[PDB]
Amino acid sequence: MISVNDFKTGLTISVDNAIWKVIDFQHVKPGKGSAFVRSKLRNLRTGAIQEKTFRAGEKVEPAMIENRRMQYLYADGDNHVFMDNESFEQTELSSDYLKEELNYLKEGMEVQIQTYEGETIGVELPKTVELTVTETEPGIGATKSATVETGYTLNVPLFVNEGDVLIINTGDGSYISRG
């Protein structure tokens, strides 16, 4: 493990049943005695920030995060199958893990998946996506509702027609323009 005398910005560690990144830290020398570390840690699941103190002799546990470039192949009922671009290994993720991301995912999309000791900790989508309109009122600074091919519904300009391709921001869910 990591000694209190060997910290640096950016180390990844496991402590108190969470995984964390060292954002900043101070190496403390108390008078003439035994040194310790006060660290600022970011939780790699939630983004919360907490202070943690490591005392001399403690032996902090390292954490290895795997980051993989993957392709979404297709849905298999409740299973969503992704392929590793380098190895061709397949991973199956569930709708109940991907609840919000399914508003935007479509067959063929490239994603990045992060894993810690077998657990899946994140899926990073493209920043924008192109999705077709399956339901909206016909055309005849005002908006109307539209449903796209994933089931996602959003507000769009009055000129949009069923079958149009929309460019949508995956961060805030908003309409950008037509494709």
Side-chain angles (χ1 to χ4, degrees), residues 2-179:
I2 300 151
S3 152
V4 306
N5 301 319
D6 293 319
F7 268 56
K8 82 174 182 166
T9 307
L11 294 176
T12 57
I13 62 180
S14 169
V15 65
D16 297 329
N17 288 294
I19 53 171
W20 311 84
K21 189 165 270 264
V22 172
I23 294 337
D24 209 344
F25 76 97
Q26 182 192 9
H27 189 229
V28 182
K29 174 64 179 182
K32 286 285 184 178
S34 199
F36 62 93
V37 164
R38 290 174 170 162
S39 71
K40 179 185 256 195
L41 301 184
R42 182 187 184 265
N43 189 315
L44 293 181
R45 275 187 263 257
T46 67
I49 293 171
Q50 296 185 18
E51 195 189 59
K52 231 76 127 162
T53 299
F54 298 101
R55 291 139 213 103
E58 250 199 48
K59 290 292 197 169
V60 188
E61 187 175 332
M64 185 186 83
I65 275 62
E66 308 163 26
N67 199 353
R68 298 279 182 263
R69 302 268 184 178
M70 315 279 291
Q71 178 194 338
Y72 180 40
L73 297 187
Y74 38 67
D76 159 44
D78 204 84
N79 294 310
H80 300 267
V81 183
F82 294 78
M83 193 178 70
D84 186 309
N85 289 344
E86 295 178 337
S87 77
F88 297 119
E89 294 163 297
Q90 293 187 9
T91 298
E92 297 183 317
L93 302 180
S94 63
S95 304
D96 300 301
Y97 182 89
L98 296 165
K99 189 137 255 52
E100 276 308 295
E101 290 86 6
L102 283 174
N103 282 332
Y104 313 118
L105 275 162
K106 81 165 154 189
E107 286 168 343
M109 181 170 301
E110 301 281 338
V111 304
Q112 299 183 77
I113 302 182
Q114 299 88 46
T115 302
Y116 166 68
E117 301 182 8
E119 191 204 1
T120 306
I121 65 180
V123 184
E124 180 181 344
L125 270 31
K127 300 299 181 72
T128 65
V129 63
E130 291 198 322
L131 300 175
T132 57
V133 174
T134 57
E135 183 173 62
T136 194
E137 284 286 88
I140 294 169
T143 61
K144 66 181 174 185
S145 189
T147 303
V148 298
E149 63 189 82
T150 58
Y152 182 55
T153 302
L154 77 175
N155 288 326
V156 305
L158 301 184
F159 55 77
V160 166
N161 304 306
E162 275 190 20
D164 280 353
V165 178
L166 310 186
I167 303 169
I168 296 164
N169 183 313
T170 65
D172 69 8
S174 61
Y175 169 93
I176 307 171
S177 66
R178 287 190 295 185

